[PDB]
Amino acid sequence: VRLIQFEKVTEEPMGITLKLNEKQSCTVARILHGGMIHRQGSLHVGDEILEINGTNVTNHSVDQLQKAMKETKGMISLKVIPNQQ
Numbered sequence: 001v002r003l004i005q006f007e008k009v010t011e012e013p014m015g016i017t018l019k020l021n022e023k024q025s026c027t028v029a030r031i032l033h034g035g036m037i038h039r040q041g042s043l044h045v046g047d048e049i050l051e052i053n054g055t056n057v058t059n060h061s062v063d064q065l066q067k068a069m070k071e072t073k074g075m076i077s078l079k080v081i082p083n084q085q
Contacts, residue, residue: 001050001079001080001081001082002047002079003077003078003079004037004040004043004076004077004080005075005076006036006040006075006076007036008069008070008072008073008074008075008076009073010035012035013035014031014036014037015031015032016030016035017029017030017031018062018066019062020048024058024060024061024062025048025058026058027047027049028045028046028047028048028080029046030045031043044080044082046083047080047081047082047083048080048081049078049079049080049081050079050080050081051078051079052068052069052076052077052079053068053069053072053075053076053078055068
């Protein structure tokens, strides 16, 4: 597995999005240049996320998580899997 810790408060967040199949497998999609994600490096687009900031994202819709991320103050920890499928 893998984790990603970033700060969500800035007036111009990293701006990222994820897309999943019909199984709501929350698979990373895009990452706006700059911010923290695109700069993170360790991140890998297309990789699935099991849970972020301690949230079982492996059940709720991505829209629920997207806001679920914005929900907390800012410090989020996304659990991702290596891109070696």
